Design a protein around this ligand. Structure first.
Ligand SMILES: Nc1ncnc2c1ncn2[C@@H]1O[C@H](COP(=O)(O)OP(=O)(O)OP(=O)(O)O)[C@@H](O)[C@H]1O
Ligand SMILES: Nc1ncnc2c1ncn2[C@@H]1O[C@H](COP(=O)(O)OP(=O)(O)O)[C@@H](O)[C@H]1O
Ligand SMILES: [Mg+2]
Length: 1410
């Protein structure tokens, strides 16, 4: 076409048929100089404009940058002179073909652009992008063909082409130099991470990750030695991006449901929000797949060259290079694809793991009755994680099937219509695989549903634990948690067995089709025999389809888990949120709040707890609502906050709100943080609140004073202390409306007077702010501006103090009845060196040592079958040479195929059995870990719980113990299979050759060397993964713990930031993991392809003698052992990582323990008979690193002596009771009860004969029956008697589903008043001779307090009672009274005597008001 262009031809095929074959010279300067050149022009404007569109800040002129420009500049002048040389020496009479014109001119106009693109590239963040960098490689490789041909003409004989030839070398020569300066070097001061700053050629070999790995080897990594993830995927960006799509999809589904009602969206949302990252991988999968069939063909071209002799070295060496470059690009394309999916995996496990938290804030109370802090954790940890694993294998759906057909395509060359039956079995898998899937999903959904029921009934155990220690309920809860565990393993095992059948069928399809296809070929059309060449020629790679079908069986397994996990996220994120419509949050209102005939019900179909409410409060007032227990006080406050759901009414409020919940909620951290609540610190106001609210005395004894770390849910403080913090927090915030729901019940009388006048009084801090109040004590009624007596959700009366008492009624009689050591939580201790081998042995011991032997036996006894199969082919391929077409019989040689078929099945069964003992072996093993950890974490001393947040423990039961169930058991199977793959392959070679197997020796070291170099960097990026995951659950529980407080101050936006930051601290340590895994594949596969290429060259250089099948035997095996070793160094680093999970689970199995529950010494059956209690200078210390909280207490209590104790807040009143139950060890002294030592006997020989009513009411989810008797050892008839005494029958009777009611977490259903009475109900059942009362009247009215008091002094006449109290009203009745301060008992005697003598009790008496 262009022969005239150069006075030559395109390509004379005669040239390429010679041994010393050369590409045509004109050909090169026509297309080989166009292909790279068309690259720039055809694409440069896009890149050139692309960067300028996103113009960034100016660029610092780097030292290296000029080197790039000047060298390219040389290419401009270099190409320039030759153009002049064309016209300077060949312009007159010299025939000048167009090539002499275009060759420099096009380059001259091209290199000029290179300057600009290389210049404009400065302003971009990435200094050496893919575009320019690929040009050099695409040019140098293409330009290489020119280099060689110039040598040939030049070397064989000098010519006149030095004018252009010599110059060309320099032009090409710099290109090599430019690449090194350009494609590799990277440097800049920005972004605090190489991830975004690395030359393209160095960003596909992950050379920029060398820094982390080298750090790991020299020392253990740390949370500060990993770079924060790039802004492309930062939780803030993801949530904002994902949400806008989720909202639209949710609406469409929401409007969709309207159609069905009057008579399935999540997976859509995720796809619609990740267009590119899915599409980009897809187009990057086909390229990988294409190169999957380039390599095998190249091997065939090599064998043909090897077997043949007349072939030229030209086709020989050239094939070897392509065997390297073709595979080399495959590694870059593949790994560049995996790291493009896992990113999508860790990028969808943050949208879900963040959206789940967000929805937790806005879920209506109705929905939260279903989910819990426990269930949502499972949704956050396991379900989200299972939704990240699918992305790894998400693309096998169509990639595999495409490979199958393409593999079939090659095989249909040999076979015609016979293969129709062959595909018949391959399609007979589809319905078999379908039925199992259906029977596999229904068994999966049961597992998750039963996994939640475990955490829910166990998260509550951790939250309320002191109860479990007080009453010996560990056996009961220890006996029903496993009962839920068994209900799961019975299901996980079944789901594991089904994974054996699916695995079995796929490992049997390839061999089954082989047998059937041959039979049909003989059945119908036997006119041709194929000369037995079907043995290996048609089956040389017929089994290549195994790898496709070897990754699938576990792939489908993952998709069922994802298909089920994503079904729950839908149910969660779809939960209806609370409605603020009924609460008209106006801004300009004459009054403060308007109740316009409102009526609110807790749940949809129920009687409203607020009925016909109609009330108005002026812009400044002090309203003090009052009434009987369970009358709607707290609900009315919650109604305004929007928690309740309105029916037939509306509410209006002007301004903001402040809330003080009845059940005080305290965050974790310093006191300052709790009071500040995130607002700017102001010293001036801070001192006012601390002084105004009686906190200074409380700050004295706390170790660190102000900065004294407070324990989750306020373990340190107790009652009065907690309430002061809650009250101060609202006062400091300085809002408009204050809603105080019983804020000062816990505190004593003297403090309460101080609190009211200074803080809430008419001249207090809240002088002008409106302030609703809910008081159970009639003390402050005279000072109230208005009162609202409400009973059963109705305003029975409403008037000022004087106005109400004027009318004779309940209120009139209501009054008449009245008249450094500061740090607790410590950082997780992460093992540094390496997983001690004792951990592996422990896990292996859990598995049956009988089973492991058989499991290994089956696999090794499997591989032998695999060895025989291939060995059979070798003994079968030789048949053709000895026999002939006519001499080969059929009746006697059908055994050859028969053996292969039967032998093929033997391998299929043999692996199936191995996978089966695995299920029993592993499931049982996972059972003995949980049964040990749970049986030990229920015996740790209270000390362990106080310091360790609930986040740590709950994590080891969802995040980790799940790994031992799903991931670790699977990996331990792959490793065994790979290892026996190595042994099988080595035996094959060993038989073939005596001592040439020694090739393994160098290769083994090269692989073992790198593996040992990399494990110590992936292991330390897995402990960090599970060590920075604990705070997520810790914080999440803290949020849901007290929700109403947050929504009262509208501080939601700040809380999002925390969880939005904690996740970013956990992504940083998991994204850096997957990259740390890709870096292994590249810098390992490169060693693989290099080994094959080195063998390939070695083969050709000795082609003269070495020849025959040996070339195929060595290349095929050299390309096989290098595969498994690659597939065995990754797996052996996968068990070495995942086994970290077992290390953490084993960590808590070895924590300290309390004294044995039951010891050899058994107290006499009727040990507690009288009630003697003797204290002998007892000393107590909460933690070893603290001073004696109780200092040398000595006292005695007579039999049946009604005894009470009084003292200042935090004077050991509560601690003294915690000593009887041996919750703390005897630091000094001793105690004897009924003449029996307490430290001598076991804990459960004691705590079953003592009763205590903790100040805090803790309840467990489920029916009231369990919360009153979890042992289930008590009849129902006696329960009613027990409840009746506690004056709780009336409320229970009203509940239609009374006895078998349902109780949410921590008794959310029941008011704090009812919880205390119910918690007192437990005490009635035991009827033990000893009964401790701990502020049981804090959350009860006076009349009800008398009623319960009446029983305790009437129906309990044969049991010593130690009543700890703050109010004195219920202490004069006690026979004796004790006064203790600073852990020192002061007074002891009857109330009358202490009053006669002036002293500490006397002033307490006078100040008490009596
Ligand atoms: N979160 C809840 N879910 C369902 N029912 C609830 C809830 N909170 C309270 N109730 C029901 O409302 C009634 C209690 O009313 P409310 O919670 O307003 O009492 P309260 O002011 O806390 O009482 P008290 O003064 O006795 O402490 C009882 O029927 C209780 O079962
Ligand atoms: N979880 C805890 N860990 C360590 N010390 C505690 C804890 N709880 C309370 N204390 C100590 O108890 C003392 C006050 O006694 P306390 O238990 O508050 O009696 P009461 O609760 O009846 O007021 C404080 O000095 C405090 O240091
Ligand atoms: Mg209440």
């Amino acid at each position: 076409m262009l022969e005239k262009f150069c006075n030559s031809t395109f390509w004379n095929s005669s040239f390429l048929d010679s041994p010393e074959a050369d590409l045509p010279l004109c050909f090169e300067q026509t297309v080989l100089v166009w292909i790279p050149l068309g690259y720039l022009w055809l694409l440069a404007p896009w890149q050139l404009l692309h960067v300028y569109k996103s113009r960034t800040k100016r660029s610092s002129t780097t030292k290296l940058y000029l080197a790039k420009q000047v060298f390219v500049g040389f290419l401009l002048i270099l190409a320039a002179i030759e153009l002049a040389l064309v016209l300077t020496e060949d312009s007159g009479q010299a025939t000048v073909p167009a090539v002499r014109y275009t060759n420099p001119s096009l380059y001259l106009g091209t290199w000029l652009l290179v300057l600009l693109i290389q210049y404009s590239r400065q302003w971009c963040v990435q200094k050496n992008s893919w575009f320019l960098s690929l040009f050099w490689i695409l040019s140098i490789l293409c330009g290489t063909f020119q280099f060689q041909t110039l040598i040939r003409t030049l070397l064989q004989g000098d010519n006149s082409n030095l004018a252009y030839s010599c110059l060309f070398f320099i032009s090409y020569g710099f290109q090599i130099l430019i690449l090194i300066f350009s494609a590799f070097s990277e440097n800049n001061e920005s972004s605090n991470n190489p991830s975004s700053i690395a030359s393209f050629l160095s960003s596909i070999t992950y050379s920029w990750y060398d820094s982390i790995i080298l750090k790991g080897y020299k020392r253990p990594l740390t949370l500060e030695d990993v770079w924060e993830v790039d802004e492309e995927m930062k939780t803030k960006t993801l949530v904002s991006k994902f949400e806008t799509h989720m909202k639209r999809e949710l609406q469409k589904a929401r409007r969709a449901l309207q159609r069905r009602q009057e008579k399935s969206w999540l997976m859509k949302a995720l796809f619609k929000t990740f267009y590119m990252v899915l599409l980009k991988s897809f187009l990057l999968k086909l390229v990988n797949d294409i190169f999957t069939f380039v390599s095998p063909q190249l091997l065939k071209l090599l064998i043909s060259f090897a077997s043949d002799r007349d072939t030229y070295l030209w086709i020989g060496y050239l094939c070897a290079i392509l065997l390297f470059t073709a595979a080399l690009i495959q590694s870059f394309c593949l790994q560049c694809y995996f790291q493009l999916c896992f990113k999508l995996g860790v990028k969808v496990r943050t949208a879900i793991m963040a959206s789940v938290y967000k929805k937790a804030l806005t879920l209506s109370n109705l929905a939260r009755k279903e989910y819990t802090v426990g269930e949502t954790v499972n949704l956050m940890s396991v379900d989200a994680q299972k939704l990240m694993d699918v992305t790894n294998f998400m693309h096998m759906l169509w990639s595999s099937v495409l490979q199958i057909v393409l593999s079939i395509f090659f095989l249909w060359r040999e076979l015609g219509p016979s293969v129709l039956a062959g595909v018949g079995v391959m399609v007979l898998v589809i319905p078999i695989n379908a039925i199992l899937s259906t029977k596999s999903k229904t068994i999966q959904v049961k597992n998750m549903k039963n996994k939640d029921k475990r955490l829910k009934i166990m998260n509550e155990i951790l939250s309320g634990i002191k109860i479990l220690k007080y009453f010996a309920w560990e056996p009961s809860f220890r006996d029903q948690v496993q009962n839920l565990r068994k209900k799961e393993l019975k299901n996980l095992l079944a789901f594991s067995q089904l994974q054996c059948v699916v695995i079995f069928v796929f490992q049997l399809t390839p061999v089954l089709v082989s047998v059937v296809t041959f039979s049909v070929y003989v059945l119908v059309d036997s006119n041709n025999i194929l000369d037995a060449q079907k043995a290996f020629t048609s089956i040389t790679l017929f089994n290549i389809l195994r790898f496709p079908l070897s990754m699938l069986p576990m792939m489908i397994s993952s998709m069922l888990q994802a298909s089920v996990s994503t079904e729950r996220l839908e149910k969660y994120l779809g939960g209806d949120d609370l409605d603020t419509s009924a609460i008209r949050h106006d801004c300009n209102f004459d009054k403060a709040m308007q109740f316009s005939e409102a009526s609110f019900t807790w749940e949809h179909d129920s009687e409203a707890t607020v009925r016909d409410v109609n009330l108005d409060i002026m812009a400044g007032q002090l309203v003090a609502v009052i009434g009987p227990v369970g009358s709607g006080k707290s609900s009315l406050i919650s109604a305004m906050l929007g928690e309740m759901e309105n029916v037939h009414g509306h509410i209006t409020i002007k301004g903001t709100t402040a809330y003080v919940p009845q059940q005080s909620w305290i965050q974790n951290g310093t006191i300052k943080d709790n009071i500040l609540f995130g607002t700017e610190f102001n010293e001036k106001r801070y001192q006012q609140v601390l002084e105004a609210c009686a906190l200074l005395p409380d700050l004295e004894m706390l170790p660190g004073g102000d900065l004294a770390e407070i324990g989750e849910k306020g373990i340190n403080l107790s009652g009065g202390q907690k309430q002061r913090i809650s009250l101060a927090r609202a006062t400091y915030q300085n809002l408009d409306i204050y809603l105080l729901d019983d804020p000062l019940s816990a505190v004593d009388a003297h403090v309460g007077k101080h609190i009211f006048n200074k803080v809430l009084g008419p001249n207090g801090l809240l002088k002008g702010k409106t302030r609703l109040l809910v008081t159970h004590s009639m003390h402050f009624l005279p000072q109230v501006d208005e009162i609202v007596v409400l009973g059963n959700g109705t305003i029975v009366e409403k008037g000022s103090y004087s106005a109400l008492l004027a009318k004779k009624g309940e209120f009139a009689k209501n009054l008449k009845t009245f008249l450094k050591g500061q740090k607790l939580i410590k950082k997780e201790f992460i093992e540094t060196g390496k997983v001690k081998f004792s951990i592996y042995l422990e896990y292996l011991q859990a598995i049956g040592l009988f089973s492991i032997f058989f499991i290994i036996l089956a696999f090794v006894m499997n591989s032998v079958a695999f060895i025989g199969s291939n060995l059979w082919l070798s003994a079968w391929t030789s048949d053709s040479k000895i026999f002939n077409s006519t001499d080969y019989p059929a009746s006697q040689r059908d055994m050859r195929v028969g053996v292969y078929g039967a032998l093929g099945l033997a391998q299929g069964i043999f692996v199936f059995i191995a996978h089966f003992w695995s299920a029993f072996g592993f499931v049982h093993a996972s059972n003995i870990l949980h049964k040990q950890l749970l049986n030990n974490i229920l015996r740790a001393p209270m000390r362990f719980f106080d310091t360790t947040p609930t986040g740590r423990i709950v994590n080891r039961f969802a995040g980790d113990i799940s790994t031992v169930d799903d991931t670790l058991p699977q990996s331990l199977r792959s490793w065994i299979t790979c290892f026996l793959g190595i042994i099988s392959t080595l035996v094959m070679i060993c038989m073939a050759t005596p001592v040439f197997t020694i090739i393994v020796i160098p290769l083994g070291i090269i692989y073992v060397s790198v593996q040992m170099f990399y494990v110590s960097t992936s292991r330390q990026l897995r402990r960090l993964d599970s060590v920075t995951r604990s705070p997520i659950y810790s914080h999440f529980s803290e949020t849901v713990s007290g929700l109403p407080v947050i929504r009262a101050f509208e501080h939601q936006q700040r809380f999002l930031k925390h969880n939005e930051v904690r996740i970013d601290t956990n992504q940083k340590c998991v994204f850096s993991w997957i990259t740390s895994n890709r870096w292994l594949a590249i810098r390992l596969e490169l060693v693989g392809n290099l080994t094959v290429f080195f063998s390939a060259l070695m083969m050709v250089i000795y082609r003269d003698t070495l020849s025959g099948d040996t070339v195929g035997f060595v290349l095929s095996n050299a390309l096989n052992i290098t595969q498994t070793l690659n597939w065995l160094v990754r797996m052996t680093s996968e068990i070495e990582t995942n086994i970290v999970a077992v290390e953490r689970i084993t960590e808590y199995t070895k924590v300290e323990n309390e004294a044995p529950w039951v010891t050899d010494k058994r107290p006499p059956p009727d040990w507690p008979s009288k009630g003697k209690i003797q204290f002998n200078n007892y000393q107590v210390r909460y933690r070893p690193e603290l001073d004696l909280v109780l200092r040398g207490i000595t006292c005695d209590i007579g039999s049946m002596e009604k005894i009470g104790v009084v003292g200042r807040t935090g004077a050991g009143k509560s601690s003294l009771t915690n000593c009887l139950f041996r919750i703390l060890e005897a630091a000094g002294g001793q105690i004897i009860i009924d003449g029996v030592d307490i430290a001598s006997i076991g804990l459960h020989d004691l705590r079953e004969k003592l009763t205590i009513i903790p100040q805090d009411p803790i309840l467990f989810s489920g029916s009231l029956r369990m919360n009153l008797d979890p042992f289930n050892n008590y009849s129902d008839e006696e329960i009613w008697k027990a409840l009746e005494l506690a004056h709780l029958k009336s409320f229970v009777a009203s509940l239609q589903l009374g006895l078998s009611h349902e109780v949410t977490e921590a008794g959310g259903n029941l008011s704090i008043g009812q919880r205390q009475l119910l918690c007192l109900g437990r005490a009635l059942l035991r009827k033990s001779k000893i009964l401790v009362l701990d502020e049981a009247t804090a959350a009860v009215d006076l009349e009800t307090d008398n009623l319960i008091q009446t029983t305790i002094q009437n129906e309990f006449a044969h049991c010593t009672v130690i009543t700890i109290a703050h109010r004195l009203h219920t202490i004069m009745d006690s026979d004796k009274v004790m006064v203790l301060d600073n852990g020192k008992i002061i007074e002891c005697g009857s109330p009358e005597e202490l009053l006669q003598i002036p002293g500490p009790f006397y002033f307490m008496a006078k100040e008490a008001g009596i």
